[PDB]
């Protein structure tokens, strides 16, 4: 599950969405997402 | 003085109008018989052996079966692969993530999207886009002067000092076509457009608009998207640049199937067409019923 | 309807050749758009026997048929593909009438004499008149028999479907 | 034998009770012949069972 | 201030066996069961 | 002047103690003159008692039961008074469709159709009401669909009233073949079934109706399958065995509700159980496809409108209580969408809303399924439900709202300039 | 249809507005103001955009 990295410290970030991408998002928004997924899959001889 | 053909063709006229529907009952057009058709004349034959139709109907399946059995490769090929390294994937494309993200139900995400992508995936897929300038009758020279140069010998000092230029490499920007397929709300967009680029500090993937804008959706948790580039390899991207990579085989069929299936047409000159090739058009010549004909 | 009386004319000079017969279709708005209707460059249409083989290719097969190799330097057969591919494709004729109208009006309007089982009268917002070229080479034709019709826009994009010769022939040809 | 499939029709799909059957009802009488024709939908109960419910309104209607 | 791992090539994502399993499982039923959409159209 | 029976319409349809019981007969009946005519006299006893027991005209949520009372029971089986305020009803949708038209230039014909039908959208037929009953006779150039693609004659079949006909019993959840009354809608009647569900309904209500369907097969069995109907001779013992026979939904629908000094519930409820034998099907909603008229067809000749409208169903004024488990709110119109009852009969509804509590409003802004949710296609758009959402329940708002339908066609211009107008 | 409408409120998500009913809370003398960021759509009286 936890991912291995190269880099040993991170670093803050200073860019805005529209030059640089970040996987940022909090846990309960995950999941939820995660529940909404799991019935819009299934909703969808 | 004798008669015309075109009187008695006139006079004659027609006794028929009747509809008939395509074999997927898509689409429907009339057909008009003429009593004076030279069709008449002939002795014909006509019979509809039931062996006949049913070896017919099982040409026409296995010829609409063509593109799905490429999108079940590339699934099948994506679950090989992925046992093959054990479920450990590395990052391809740039993106910044955080070890406190809880990375189960984003892989949870990944099957969701994996079925969805299955469920929805059609022949306007990235696959056939990628795949059909390929049947380009210019593909396999092009294909051939890309070797040669891509391995040709390092210039020796004579050449540099002396005659013609270097000989230009392949250009740093790349056209891919892409699937899209998000969770949240069930949605699927095959078949987009993108521009690939490699990033100079380190040599990861960033995939732009072809506008130029950055295209943000690695940074989406709920969507995974499918790449194909024109070399015929494939990833399958997860949140956070981290890929499935392999290549799209396609020797599970026969050349004339994929040929006539989806072979890119040419035209030929016709009204308004530059005689000369490569030259810029004038405007169409539409037939509109806005104007007065010109006559 | 010049398109059809011509097209009648040129299958019956070149029949001895190509064991062809003619076949006349009218297209409207349940087949194409107005804008499709009013940009339409080119009709082609193929004939597919009974297992599945194009005319154009050779009787006893190709090398097509192996199967595709994979290799961008060998595309797939690329040009001598390409080539065989292209030839089992003809162009037919075609006119497009742009503004609505009554079919059985307009036929009237010309020259021709109509006489139908039910007159019912049939309206459409365009229409384009093609014929198309149906195979009997033994002089027989059998109800298995598909063919094909692709329609091509200045842009090179194009639309295909396929009929199989019962729907277009089961009560005609028993009527003769 | 109808009388097997009489029986199983009106004791397992109709799930009628005991004490109406063929020889009270000759609505029911009548309607046994079309229903034993249709083997299948016997697992959709409620469709035999509205059926017999408009036949026997039919019946008692003023026509 | 939140603070993230930039990007690299050596950096990986590991699956925890659990979801391998399934995903395992979801590739043999969906090799077996043939639900090919060439057989619903001609059907 | 009907200033009082519009009142008395505006407090009929937004009582919260509308009896759901109508809801169930206009399903029954659904449009079918026979079926109307053997329920009459149920019908005769429910609107008197409703009437005087509750300060509120009955039936009036439907457009086919409003206009069969008003025809068929004016014979003297209603007080003059109420069959007065049903007349006044169906005049009041003479007088809008009166000045939808212009009658003093609509004469003549262009191109196959009524001059009337260029002018006014409410006069065309490829507009339709949103509850349809019958399908039309005129259907020149518009295609509906049921499944995936427009319904060829083959894919319509006929009802079969008054024989055996379990094979479409058993096809009652299916989609692709449309069972249909063999009755077809009139050109006038189509018109005035558009102004009462355009024009009066949303005015009167201001948005706060809503579209259900009832699983009236299993609805059916668990009501009328029993003894007591089945052995319906061709016993009236006491109240409490009547309780017992007919069963507890049945006593607690009709009792007060439709019984009489002089009919006890036993029978009430047998006069309601001849009408089963027409039933129809369960509810489904129909896609309409038209391209518009050769005026309006000269910019965009491609455009295909599309219009979804419900059928075999009903438009409710208040959520079903004793009928919940058998209810299926239907949101599908901006005009029919009302969140109350929506949350009231679905679940998932009303934790959509308790999660977004702004959706909870009425002017449109509610968001409609995807299927559903096509606001560009639509013939009616968002200016519709605001000015229904603000607009008072006088019948001024009627005729404005049907006033707002005049066409934008060239041939529409110089017909109303011509006017005046 | 019937059936899926439940499975379509089963997600919490909530929809984008269409541009045709932000038109609609305008007010008439406002509407003509820059702050209706509308406005560049509105270009034919019988069309929308």
Same mark, same amino acid.
Request: aromatic share 10%; net charge neutral.
């Given at each position: 599950?936890?991912?291995?990295?190269?880099?040993?410290?991170?670093?803050?970030?200073?860019?805005?969405?529209?030059?640089?991408?970040?996987?940022?998002?909090?846990?309960?928004?995950?999941?939820?997402?995660?529940?909404?997924?799991?019935?819009?899959?299934?909703?969808?001889? | 003085?004798?008669?015309?053909?075109?009187?008695?063709?006139?006079?004659?006229?027609?006794?028929?109008?009747?509809?008939?529907?395509?074999?997927?009952?898509?689409?429907?057009?009339?057909?008009?018989?003429?009593?004076?058709?030279?069709?008449?004349?002939?002795?014909?034959?006509?019979?509809?052996?039931?062996?006949?139709?049913?070896?017919?109907?099982?040409?026409?399946?296995?010829?609409?079966?063509?593109?799905?059995?490429?999108?079940?490769?590339?699934?099948?090929?994506?679950?090989?692969?992925?046992?093959?390294?054990?479920?450990?994937?590395?990052?391809?494309?740039?993106?910044?993530?955080?070890?406190?993200?809880?990375?189960?139900?984003?892989?949870?995400?990944?099957?969701?999207?994996?079925?969805?992508?299955?469920?929805?995936?059609?022949?306007?897929?990235?696959?056939?886009?990628?795949?059909?300038?390929?049947?380009?009758?210019?593909?396999?020279?092009?294909?051939?002067?890309?070797?040669?140069?891509?391995?040709?010998?390092?210039?020796?000092?004579?050449?540099?000092?002396?005659?013609?230029?270097?000989?230009?490499?392949?250009?740093?920007?790349?056209?891919?076509?892409?699937?899209?397929?998000?969770?949240?709300?069930?949605?699927?967009?095959?078949?987009?457009?993108?521009?690939?680029?490699?990033?100079?500090?380190?040599?990861?993937?960033?995939?732009?608009?072809?506008?130029?804008?950055?295209?943000?959706?690695?940074?989406?948790?709920?969507?995974?998207?499918?790449?194909?580039?024109?070399?015929?390899?494939?990833?399958?991207?997860?949140?956070?640049?981290?890929?499935?990579?392999?290549?799209?085989?396609?020797?599970?069929?026969?050349?004339?199937?994929?040929?006539?299936?989806?072979?890119?047409?040419?035209?030929?000159?016709?009204?308004?067409?530059?005689?000369?090739?490569?030259?810029?058009?004038?405007?169409?010549?539409?037939?509109?019923?806005?104007?007065?004909?010109?006559? | 309807?010049?398109? +059809?009386?011509?097209?009648?004319?040129?299958?019956?000079?070149?029949?001895?050749?190509?064991?062809?017969?003619?076949? +006349?279709?009218?297209?409207?708005?349940?087949?194409?758009?107005?804008?499709?209707?009013?940009?339409?460059?080119?009709?082609?249409?193929?004939?597919?026997?009974?297992?599945?083989?194009?005319?154009?290719?050779?009787?006893?097969?190709?090398?097509?048929?192996?199967?595709?190799?994979?290799?961008?330097?060998?595309?797939?057969?690329?040009?001598?593909?390409?080539?065989?591919? &292209?030839?089992?494709?003809?162009?037919?004729?075609? *006119?497009?009438?742009?503004?609505?109208?009554?079919?059985?009006?307009?036929? *009237?309007?010309?020259?021709?004499?109509?006489?139908?089982?039910?007159?019912? *009268?049939?309206?459409?917002?365009?229409?384009?008149?093609?014929?198309?070229?149906? &195979?009997?080479?033994?002089?027989?034709?059998?109800?298995?028999?598909?063919? +094909?019709?692709?329609?091509?826009?200045?842009?090179?994009?194009? *639309?295909?479907?396929?009929?199989?010769?019962?729907?277009?022939?089961?009560?005609?040809?028993?009527?003769? | 034998?109808?009388?097997?499939?009489?029986?199983?029709?009106?004791?397992?799909?109709?799930?009628?009770?005991?004490?109406?059957?063929?020889?009270?009802?000759?609505?029911?009488?009548?309607?046994?012949?079309?229903?034993?024709?249709?083997?299948?939908?016997?697992?959709?109960?409620?469709?035999?069972?509205?059926?017999?419910?408009?036949?026997?309104?039919?019946?008692?209607?003023?026509? | 201030?939140?603070?993230?791992?930039?990007?690299?090539?050596?950096?990986?994502?590991?699956?925890?066996?659990?979801?391998?399993?399934?995903?395992?499982?979801?590739?043999?039923?969906?090799?077996?069961?043939?639900?090919?959409?060439?057989?619903?159209?001609?059907? | 002047?009907?200033?009082?029976?519009?009142?008395?319409?505006?407090?009929?349809?937004?009582?919260?103690?509308?009896?759901?019981?109508?809801?169930?007969?206009?399903?029954?009946?659904?449009?079918?003159?026979?079926?109307?005519?053997?329920?009459?006299?149920?019908?005769?006893?429910?609107?008197?008692?409703?009437?005087?027991? /509750?300060?509120?005209?009955?039936?009036?949520?439907?457009?086919?039961?409003?206009?069969?009372?008003?025809?068929?029971?004016?014979?003297?089986?209603?007080?003059?008074?109420?069959?007065?305020?049903?007349?006044?009803?169906?005049?009041?949708?003479?007088?809008?469709?009166?000045?939808?038209?212009?009658?003093?230039?609509?004469?003549?014909?262009?191109?196959?159709?009524?001059?009337?039908?260029?002018?006014?959208?409410?006069?065309?037929?490829?507009?339709?009401?949103?509850?349809?009953?019958?399908?039309?006779?005129?259907?020149?150039?518009?295609?509906?669909?049921?499944?995936?693609?427009?319904?060829?004659?083959?894919?319509?079949?006929? /009802?079969?009233?008054?024989?055996?006909?379990?094979?479409?019993?058993?096809?009652?959840?299916?989609?692709?073949?449309?069972?249909?009354?063999?009755?077809?809608?009139?050109?006038?009647?189509?018109?005035?079934?558009?102004?009462?569900?355009?024009?009066?309904?949303?005015?009167?209500?201001?948005?706060?109706?809503?579209?259900?369907?009832?699983?009236?097969?299993?609805?059916?069995?668990?009501?009328?399958? /029993?003894?007591?109907?089945?052995?319906?001779?061709?016993?009236?013992?006491?109240?409490?065995?009547?309780?017992?026979?007919?069963?507890?939904?049945?006593?607690?629908?009709?009792?007060?509700?439709?019984?009489?000094?002089?009919?006890?519930?036993?029978?009430?409820?047998?006069?309601?159980?001849?009408?089963?034998?027409?039933?129809?099907?369960?509810?489904?909603?129909?896609?309409?496809?038209?391209?518009?008229?050769?005026?309006?067809?000269?910019?965009?000749?491609?455009?295909?409108?599309?219009?979804?409208?419900?059928?075999?169903?009903?438009?409710?004024?208040?959520?079903?209580?004793?009928?919940?488990?058998?209810?299926?709110?239907?949101?599908?119109?901006?005009?029919?969408?009302?969140?109350?009852?929506?949350?009231?009969?679905?679940?998932?509804?009303? /934790?959509?809303?308790?999660?977004?509590?702004?959706?909870?409003?009425?002017?449109?802004?509610?968001?409609?399924?995807?299927?559903?949710?096509?606001?560009?296609?639509?013939?009616?758009?968002?200016?519709?439900?605001?000015?229904?959402?603000?607009?008072?329940?006088?019948?001024?708002?009627?005729?404005?709202?049907?006033?707002?339908?005049?066409?934008?066609?060239?041939?529409?211009?110089?017909?109303?300039?011509?006017?005046?107008? | 249809?019937?059936?899926?409408?439940?499975?379509?409120?089963?997600?919490?998500?909530?929809?984008?507005?269409?541009?045709?009913?932000?038109?609609?809370?305008?007010?008439?003398?406002?509407?003509?103001?820059?702050?209706?960021?509308?406005?560049?759509?509105?270009?034919?009286?019988?069309?929308?955009?």
């Amino acid at each position: 599950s936890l991912l291995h990295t190269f880099w040993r410290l991170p670093v803050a970030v200073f860019f805005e969405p529209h030059e640089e991408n970040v996987l940022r998002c909090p846990e309960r928004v995950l999941r939820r997402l995660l529940e909404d997924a799991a019935v819009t899959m299934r909703g969808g001889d | 003085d004798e008669v015309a053909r075109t009187d008695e063709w006139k006079g004659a006229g027609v006794s028929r109008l009747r509809e008939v529907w395509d074999v997927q009952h898509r689409v429907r057009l009339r057909v008009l018989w003429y009593v004076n058709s030279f069709w008449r004349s002939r002795e014909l034959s006509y019979d509809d052996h039931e062996v006949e139709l049913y070896r017919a109907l099982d040409a026409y399946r296995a010829r609409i079966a063509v593109e799905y059995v490429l999108i079940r490769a590339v699934r099948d090929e994506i679950y090989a692969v992925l046992r093959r390294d054990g479920g450990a994937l590395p990052q391809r494309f740039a993106c910044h993530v955080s070890r406190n993200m809880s990375w189960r139900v984003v892989w949870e995400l990944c099957r969701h999207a994996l079925a969805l992508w299955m469920d929805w995936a059609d022949v306007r897929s990235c696959i056939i886009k990628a795949l059909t300038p390929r049947l380009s009758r210019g593909a396999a020279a092009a294909a051939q002067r890309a070797r040669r140069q891509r391995e040709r010998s390092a210039p020796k000092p004579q050449e540099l000092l002396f005659g013609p230029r270097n000989e230009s490499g392949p250009p740093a920007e790349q056209t891919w076509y892409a699937d899209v397929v998000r969770c949240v709300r069930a949605q699927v967009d095959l078949g987009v457009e993108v521009r690939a680029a490699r990033c100079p500090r380190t040599g990861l993937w960033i995939v732009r608009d072809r506008r130029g804008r950055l295209r943000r959706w690695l940074s989406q948790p709920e969507v995974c998207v499918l790449y194909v580039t024109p070399d015929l390899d494939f990833y399958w991207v997860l949140p956070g640049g981290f890929a499935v990579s392999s290549r799209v085989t396609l020797h599970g069929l026969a050349q004339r199937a994929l040929r006539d299936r989806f072979q890119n047409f040419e035209a030929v000159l016709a009204r308004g067409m530059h005689v000369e090739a490569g030259r810029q058009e004038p405007e169409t010549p539409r037939v509109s019923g806005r104007r007065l004909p010109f006559d | 309807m010049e398109t +059809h009386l011509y097209s009648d004319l040129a299958f019956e000079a070149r029949f001895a050749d190509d064991e062809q017969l003619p076949l +006349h279709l009218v297209l409207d708005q349940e087949v194409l758009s107005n804008e499709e209707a009013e940009t339409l460059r080119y009709v082609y249409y193929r004939n597919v026997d009974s297992a599945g083989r194009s005319t154009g290719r050779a009787p006893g097969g190709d090398e097509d048929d192996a199967p595709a190799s994979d290799d961008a330097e060998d595309a797939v057969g690329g040009d001598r593909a390409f080539d065989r591919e &292209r030839r089992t494709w003809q162009r037919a004729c075609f *006119r497009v009438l742009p503004r609505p109208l009554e079919l059985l009006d307009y036929l *009237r309007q010309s020259g021709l004499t109509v006489t139908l089982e039910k007159e019912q *009268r049939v309206r459409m917002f365009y229409a384009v008149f093609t014929t198309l070229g149906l &195979r009997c080479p033994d002089n027989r034709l059998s109800g298995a028999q598909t063919l +094909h019709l692709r329609l091509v826009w200045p842009d090179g994009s194009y *639309r295909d479907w396929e009929f199989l010769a019962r729907d277009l022939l089961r009560e005609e040809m028993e009527a003769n | 034998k109808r009388d097997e499939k009489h029986r199983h029709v009106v004791n397992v799909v109709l799930e009628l009770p005991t004490e109406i059957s063929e020889a009270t009802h000759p609505v029911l009488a009548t309607m046994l012949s079309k229903y034993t024709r249709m083997s299948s939908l016997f697992n959709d109960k409620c469709a035999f069972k509205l059926d017999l419910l408009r036949m026997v309104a039919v019946s008692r209607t003023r026509r | 201030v939140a603070v993230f791992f930039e990007p690299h090539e050596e950096n990986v994502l590991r699956c925890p066996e659990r979801v391998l399993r399934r995903l395992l499982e979801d590739a043999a039923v969906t090799m077996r069961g043939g639900g090919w959409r060439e057989d619903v159209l001609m059907d | 002047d009907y200033e009082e029976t519009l009142r008395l319409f505006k407090t009929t349809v937004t009582s919260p103690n509308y009896p759901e019981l109508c809801y169930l007969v206009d399903v029954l009946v659904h449009g079918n003159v026979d079926a109307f005519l053997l329920i009459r006299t149920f019908v005769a006893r429910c609107i008197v008692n409703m009437f005087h027991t /509750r300060q509120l005209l009955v039936f009036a949520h439907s457009y086919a039961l409003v206009t069969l009372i008003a025809e068929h029971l004016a014979d003297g089986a209603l007080p003059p008074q109420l069959l007065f305020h049903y007349r006044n009803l169906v005049a009041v949708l003479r007088l809008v469709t009166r000045i939808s038209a212009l009658p003093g230039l609509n004469n003549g014909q262009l191109a196959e159709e009524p001059l009337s039908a260029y002018v006014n959208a409410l006069h065309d037929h490829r507009l339709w009401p949103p509850f349809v009953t019958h399908l039309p006779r005129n259907m020149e150039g518009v295609q509906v669909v049921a499944d995936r693609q427009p319904l060829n004659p083959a894919n319509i079949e006929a /009802r079969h009233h008054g024989v055996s006909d379990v094979p479409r019993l058993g096809a009652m959840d299916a989609d692709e073949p449309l069972f249909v009354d063999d009755y077809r809608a009139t050109d006038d009647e189509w018109t005035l079934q558009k102004v009462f569900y355009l024009c009066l309904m949303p005015a009167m209500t201001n948005n706060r109706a809503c579209g259900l369907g009832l699983n009236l097969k299993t609805l059916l069995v668990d009501l009328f399958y /029993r003894p007591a109907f089945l052995l319906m001779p061709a016993p009236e013992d006491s109240i409490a065995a009547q309780r017992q026979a007919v069963g507890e939904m049945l006593t607690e629908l009709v009792e007060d509700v439709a019984t009489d000094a002089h009919t006890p519930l036993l029978q009430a409820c047998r006069e309601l159980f001849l009408a089963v034998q027409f039933v129809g099907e369960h509810v489904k909603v129909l896609e309409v496809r038209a391209p518009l008229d050769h005026a309006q067809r000269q910019g965009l000749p491609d455009f295909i409108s599309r219009q979804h409208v419900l059928y075999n169903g009903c438009c409710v004024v208040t959520a079903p209580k004793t009928l919940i488990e058998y209810s299926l709110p239907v949101p599908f119109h901006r005009f029919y969408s009302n969140p109350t009852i929506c949350a009231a009969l679905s679940d998932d509804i009303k /934790r959509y809303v308790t999660e977004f509590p702004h959706y909870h409003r009425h002017d449109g802004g509610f968001p409609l399924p995807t299927a559903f949710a096509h606001e560009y296609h639509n013939w009616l758009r968002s200016p519709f439900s605001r000015y229904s959402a603000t607009c008072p329940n006088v019948l001024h708002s009627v005729m404005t709202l049907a006033a707002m339908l005049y066409k934008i066609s060239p041939v529409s211009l110089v017909l109303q300039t011509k006017a005046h107008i | 249809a019937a059936r899926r409408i439940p499975h379509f409120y089963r997600v919490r998500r909530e929809v984008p507005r269409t541009v045709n009913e932000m038109k609609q809370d305008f007010v008439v003398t406002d509407f003509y103001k820059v702050g209706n960021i509308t406005l560049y759509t509105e270009l034919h009286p019988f069309f929308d955009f």
